[PDB]
Amino acid sequence: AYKPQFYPGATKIAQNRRDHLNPDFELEKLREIPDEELVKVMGHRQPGEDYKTVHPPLEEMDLPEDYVRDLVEPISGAKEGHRIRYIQFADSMYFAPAQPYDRARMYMWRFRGVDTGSLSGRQVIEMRESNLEEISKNVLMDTSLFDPARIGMRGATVHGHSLRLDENGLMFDALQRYVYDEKTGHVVYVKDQVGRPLDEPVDVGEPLPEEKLREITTIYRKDGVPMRDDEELLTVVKRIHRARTLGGYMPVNEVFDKLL
Amino acid sequence: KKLFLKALKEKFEEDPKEKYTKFYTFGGWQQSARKREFVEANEKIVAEKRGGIPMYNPDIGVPLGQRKLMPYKLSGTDYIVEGDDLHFMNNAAIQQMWDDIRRTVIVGMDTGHAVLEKRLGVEVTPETINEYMATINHSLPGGAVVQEHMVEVHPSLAWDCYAKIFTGDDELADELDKKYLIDINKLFPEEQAEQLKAAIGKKTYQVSRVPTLVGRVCDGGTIARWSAMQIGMSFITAYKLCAGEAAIADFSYAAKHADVVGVGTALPARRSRGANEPGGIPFGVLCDIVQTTRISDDPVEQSLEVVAVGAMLYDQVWLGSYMSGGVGFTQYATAAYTDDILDDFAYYGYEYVEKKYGINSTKPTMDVVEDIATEVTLYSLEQYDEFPTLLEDHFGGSQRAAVAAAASGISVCMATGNSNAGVNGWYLSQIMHKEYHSRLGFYGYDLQDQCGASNSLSIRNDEASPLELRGPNYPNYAMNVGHQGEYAGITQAAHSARKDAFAMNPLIKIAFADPSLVFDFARPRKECARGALREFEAAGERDVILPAK
Amino acid sequence: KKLFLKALKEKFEEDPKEKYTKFYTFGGWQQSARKREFVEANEKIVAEKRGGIPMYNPDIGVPLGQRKLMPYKLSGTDYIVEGDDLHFMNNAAIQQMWDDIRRTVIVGMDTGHAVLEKRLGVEVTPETINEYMATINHSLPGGAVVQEHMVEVHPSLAWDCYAKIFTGDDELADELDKKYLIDINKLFPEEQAEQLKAAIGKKTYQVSRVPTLVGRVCDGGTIARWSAMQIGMSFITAYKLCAGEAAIADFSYAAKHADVVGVGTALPARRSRGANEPGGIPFGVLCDIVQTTRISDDPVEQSLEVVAVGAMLYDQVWLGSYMSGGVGFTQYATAAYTDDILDDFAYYGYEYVEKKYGINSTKPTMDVVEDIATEVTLYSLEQYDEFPTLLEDHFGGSQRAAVAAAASGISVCMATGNSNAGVNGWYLSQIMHKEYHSRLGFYGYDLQDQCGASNSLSIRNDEASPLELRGPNYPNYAMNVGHQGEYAGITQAAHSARKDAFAMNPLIKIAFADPSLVFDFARPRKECARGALREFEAAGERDVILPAK
Amino acid sequence: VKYEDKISLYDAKGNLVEDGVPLEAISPLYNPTIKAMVKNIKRTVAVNLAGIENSLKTGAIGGKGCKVPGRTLDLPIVENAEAIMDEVEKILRITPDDDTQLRAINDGKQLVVQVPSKRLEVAAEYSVSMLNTAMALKEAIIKTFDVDLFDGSTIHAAIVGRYPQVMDYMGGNIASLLGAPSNMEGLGYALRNIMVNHYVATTKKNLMNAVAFASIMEQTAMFEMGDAIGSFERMHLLGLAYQGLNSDNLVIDLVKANSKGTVGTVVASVVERALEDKVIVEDKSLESGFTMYKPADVAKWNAYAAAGLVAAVIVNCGAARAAQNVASTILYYNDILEYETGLPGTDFGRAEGTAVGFSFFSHSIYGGGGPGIFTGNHVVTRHSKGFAIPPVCAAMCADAGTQMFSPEKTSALVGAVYSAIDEFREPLKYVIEGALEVKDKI
Amino acid sequence: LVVQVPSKRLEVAAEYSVSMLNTAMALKEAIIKTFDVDLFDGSTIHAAIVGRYPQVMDYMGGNIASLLGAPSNMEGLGYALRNIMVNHYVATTKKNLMNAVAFASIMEQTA
Ligand code: F43
Ligand SMILES: C[C@@H](OP(=O)(O)O)[C@H](NC(=O)CCCCCCS)C(=O)O
Ligand SMILES: O=S(=O)(O)CCS
Ligand SMILES: O=S(=O)(O)CCS
Ligand SMILES: [K+]
Ligand SMILES: [Mg+2]
């Protein structure tokens, strides 16, 4: 039986990357954000309102027999024909506990029927609206994958991942969708991810301390763990590069035996 | 001692290494003198020209300026300009740089001179050539030479139009009128003059600089045709031939097909365009348009002036307008030619290579490529980690990826003198950067970089090519920002390491040394600054034919 | 009685029927105020910019003005101008006419509105559309709407840029903000408004008028792309969507391929060019760009204003520059829109047809085509015979052949309402003219005319097409002057005889009725005169970004 | 035989057909079914008789939004489909028993025209089928209704569109699976210019057959391009066999093992199977214990990675019943595979690269569109050498109706016409039959 | 060299560029194997054979040639057999008048 190894590297950053990919690694629960509060921050619909459909349920439709196609179990939202909605995060380069390609690889290892996009300033996940809500609540917001000060939910005007932090250690947001509450020491969402004002502000808890962030981050930084210190990871990157180069030149055993 | 420190202190008030700052204190767009000028200008044109139909409105979308809007320092200069002054639409120097490239065509004269002597029995001497040169300088800008009752182009509209001559034959060069000569021996240092003359032989060429106004009204495909028509007219007049006989067709075939050298080739399918358009210019030809090799002995400086021209042309004008449009790609390009950031990384790479391998002293191997690209990539990203203001400056991942990979690619070329080894180094820098910060560029930035390693040394029909012969029509490179201009710089680095006078076309190298050009191709970053500050005198305006203002 | 008599009286001192004149006593070029201005301009402003390199020299070739150099009267106007003022390079009105055509693209909005409602579940109302229209008028000229730290295009450089909306749905039209609406019911006479609305149905369209400066720096192929980028940006902002999600790609596919209508299609092989270039514009579309049909009920006047635009665009700009260059083809084109010559011949043909057959009352037959074309050709050539000053005016045979054949072709269309019957009449006029005077046009003038009769009614793959669907890329028509503009007039005559509101594309007809356009497409001969006299205010100048005069 | 490789042929239901079949039996250079598919794709034309009738009646000729007043003709073309069909056949036919074939479908509204293959034999390329069909139709209509000579050009415009002004069938009523040569993005690319939606509609949305049709045409194009030549040939043959034709039941086996799985669990199954079949070997363990792997057979590892890619698309796009997920699936299946093993991904990074540009151009303002409008010829999706387009076809078959530019919107005409040809509708079944026919002749 | 590609390769191809593309690939591999050319120099071999392809969609500056022009140069649909230079017909028939006439008429009428 093949035992997956997930990711190479001998530093704690590479171990944090392995833990995220590993479906058997239980992510630490840090907070309890109610379903109703999260739906409101997402800003696609109000809680209790019937899910909008893109197509009729699969059971109703009479599709021709296709053995291979029907071998795969569809997710609950696909069965009910629910529309496809999104959740987008900007992750601070200053030790945020989740990073763009780290997220996408983790999503593809742990979740079913995922459309995910990785960019320097934003990381998006497009999924059947109902399934997207359960995942966002139990994995993306309640666990150590989320830090209310250094990870921001934003669908437009994403600028901030590469910027200096503010006085309270909060990441920049041109629309100020979240604010620091001095009295409680908690981060509060005053707007939805697209910038619409909320009727009721949503408390997302207190920011994680710098010592905890440095321990669990998936980013290499000279002022944290430099990538220069992970010789093992550099060996695998260079190997993939060389294997790609030689295969492109001549995909034959003799070439790989002599030059790899 | 970092080359970018001066720019950071001019741009940021706080310590360049400080991680914390203050936001939402700048009054939005009102913080910028340029944005205030735009609002005031809008109010005027809406009432006077648009009949009350609104246009520019800073309140519709994003409230710009929640963060401090930063100015930019042109690398290697002391000019500090606002970002908006670097957009191609607002910068007459960038527009003239493209106009001067677009309106250039080179025509071999030896074929035409053979038709005259061997088919027509008419003698060709330096005196007849000098008479021909005076004729084409009247005909090319739109003056008439044969027919009665001809109308003509207003001279004030075509003052930038010239026909020049150059030759590899030193004996002929000495006899030609210096007013029309592009003097290879005077314009280039001795060693460079000898490499160019040996490459071109004893051949004679005409450079047609078609009026800027022509390319503006029409397109790039017009240029070789305009030049050919007037070359034909000038031969008929200067040599008293029948004004339309069998031998005239040979001159047209030579000037339009057999002896013509343009800047770019026609593009097919979705990119359907005529010759002399930016997408048709291969990377080796772009190197040869740039003239820093003639005035500086610094191989790094030579390569980075090519990166500047490449980013301005390929990203701002070509991808940002011809292939897209709107607000465009100013800052995707400025990251490669501002605040001395790429300069610092490329100079670090040069010194690392000079000490470890020496310059142009190593045959390319995978071990050599991997060593150099890794070291330069790690140094570059460590700079963004150490200086929070540097990361806030190159805020977009695509800008950071292009800068780190360009320095890596250039450094590999300094050691090997092979452009494909250099591009292979660029691709390793890209996949390493991705694992360093767990991000790279925009959504579709790394299509060519993931394809990269496999196609870099490929021998297959649509994958193979020396980097010099690749360009914006090379399949993997046809769509995305933050690559094309940097590839041109990597191409230059291979030739700068070898101390080559040219990269791919010596005719182009000689043609763009002409002192009669409007844009200064030897100092592009300086020229860009002059355009940004509205100090650049461009050609193509229509003042004389418009109502007084 | 003869419409050209007034012009001949203004142009020639002697009686128009006189046999003799005097030559070689005018002092050459010195007789003309325009030529004197050119010599003076060469000495002053030109010389200081060239560093002693000569340019304009009237003494090098042909001594112009051995005969009297004649001015020209714009047909149907009292404006008398010098010939040089009609060259496209020296005339800002001709340049703006082309700029306005080049920078236009039409995009269907119903598909995008369906993606919003059915895929995204976002409601579309007249209020949301009005909000969208304000957004695109900020975004299309180069203003930013989503990202922080964006640079922008100076509003003073893009005041001519507009995004407009039109609809066949009268209920929606009543609810849309009039500032952005192209009002079909107000701009067109009632009967024409009904024909257009019935043709387009209940569909809604947006017209993007990209800045003039964009097409000047770049090309025609840029226009549909620039429009698509900013349409996408405006939808994201106005409807608060994720700034880059799956559904956004549908808007791009619709705006670039599935629901886009440009002025011209891309050209292949030797003519390799992008969309929205003159060669890609079919004759039926050129008719629909011209707007005389909305302001005049005269079918002859409607057809001749199309001939004027056609000659100016196809002969002066397209064949004279894009496909050749230099001094060019001003007078090959002016013969079709000056001195009321073609007007006299076309009005004679109209009256002959009106009395004998009636207007649009005869099914085309070879007998009908042969009768009309013969009569109009004989009348036309008899005018050149009777008036020596008229022959001295249209001194080139090509000019005479195009004028006589255009009047013949137009007259056949007045009787039949069939554009191919009209073009067949043009070809008979050509071969008859050849036998009348034992000459026709220039060396290669009649390639398409000898091929003409056989391909006019052909059903073969590369020979067949209604004249509306033919254009400058139709194989026989791809090379020569004195045809394309006249063919557009023949196409218009078929629709003018039928009292049609449009010839081929009702979307183009509506788009060019926009009062916000710079050039007046309803009065082209008058606009040309205004440009000739330097009274026309053009867009695209760069004053604000250049050093103070 | 140039190679000693053997493959086991399995059908679309996962049933064994035959073990020990030579690899070259599925080659475009030897397989008789592949030869027939190219011959038929080149000579078959889809005719829209209802379209011609509508264009003539309304005067909607010359392309989108065009209408020419006074140039209308009211002809009952559909009602006279049989008479028109018989005249077209008479014009095209060379010998009484040749392969000229005409068929009326949807009650004479559309026509399946198969030009005799002799006409393609004496032609340089394939445009002849469209050009000859257009001419036969023009003559047949003119003769049937005694159309006036001044109206013949109108008939031409309703059939071919704005040709020759445009070097394409702009606004025409005739169609082919192949795009005009004027639209090729590279030399030898004609068989790559086939829309994803056309493959899906032609196979009636049957997943394994849409995958097979796309892999056959893409890999045949690789031979035409010169990519599947010399030392590169075996890579393309193994690619066709394993990714496109379910060889050794590899595609179906990986799907079955991951019925309730993820892209990550598919990667783990691929590595496990490659190790079992001795396609890859352990190289060395690094400091953390991470073990790098190496191919034991470079071209065969590439084919196994390619089969796993199709399985990953089936599992992930099937769980969502949405095609948009395909670009992200192709990208991250290859990205995860490389960092799980240190091995090169599908097509040495070119499948991952294609997926990057494909994701961007299927989620941005700059170009592209939905997954169904892409082709192997497209500027965005040409980069992988036959390994990216077959998975996109699988995703479109799993889509339950989330796309605007679906095959029902873009490919109704070509879909109905080409599905009438057996080798196009069920390619897997007929290519297997062809391999068994030639197996002992090579 | 006179290279006649097997007709089977044209039978399973859409058009005729396959002959030029397959010959170019066989030549590149044959030269690289014969002289053991270094992997960093392979792109140079490609450029000497096909020219500035794929930047230009033609064999610009190449050393391989056909009587037929590239399909990218066709001026109309179905024109490939018409894109043959007059001088090519003359040189191929060794300037024999009636044979040059016959060759040109055969190709033109087949087109
Ligand atoms: C709507 C898109 C999706 C798309 O197809 N293009 C956009 C927008 C487009 C518009 C924005 C104009 C406007 O605001 O009205 C323009 C200027 C192109 C145009 N249409 O003229 C552009 N981007 Ni974008 N775009 C940029 C960039 C970026 C960076 C910004 C990262 C950050 O942290 O701020 C990210 C990609 C990434 O994450 O890597 C990005 C995405 C995006 N880019 C997201 C919007 C993100 C947002 O909501 O803020 N661009 C850059 O990384 C730098 C250059 C910058 C370009 C302008 C210039 O070059 O001056 C601009 C290039
Ligand atoms: C892909 C293609 O678009 P289409 O899919 O054909 O609509 C192509 N555009 C581009 O490649 C846009 C390039 C410039 C903008 C993106 C820079 S990252 C073009 O318009 O021909
Ligand atoms: O967000 S995207 O990567 O699609 C565009 C960057 S300009
Ligand atoms: O003399 S020619 O007829 O060849 C050219 C006319 S402008
Ligand atoms: K232009
Ligand atoms: Mg292990």
PDB file of C-alpha atoms and ligand atoms in Angstrom, chain A residues 2-5, chain D residues 282 285 289-293 340, ligand 6:
ATOM      1  CA  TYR A   2       1.392   3.409  -1.085  1.00  0.00           C
ATOM      2  CA  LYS A   3       1.988   5.800   1.809  1.00  0.00           C
ATOM      3  CA  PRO A   4       1.661   9.443   0.528  1.00  0.00           C
ATOM      4  CA  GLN A   5       4.487  11.856   1.569  1.00  0.00           C
TER       5      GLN A   5
ATOM      6  CA  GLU D 282      12.583   4.860  -5.908  1.00  0.00           C
ATOM      7  CA  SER D 285      15.367   9.548   0.536  1.00  0.00           C
ATOM      8  CA  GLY D 289      12.541  10.990   4.834  1.00  0.00           C
ATOM      9  CA  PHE D 290      10.865  12.294   1.599  1.00  0.00           C
ATOM     10  CA  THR D 291      11.670   9.831  -1.232  1.00  0.00           C
ATOM     11  CA  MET D 292      12.335  11.128  -4.767  1.00  0.00           C
ATOM     12  CA  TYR D 293      11.212   8.856  -7.641  1.00  0.00           C
ATOM     13  CA  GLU D 340       4.395  14.152  -4.104  1.00  0.00           C
TER      14      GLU D 340
HETATM   15 MG    MG F   6       8.318   6.731   1.643  1.00  0.00          MG
END
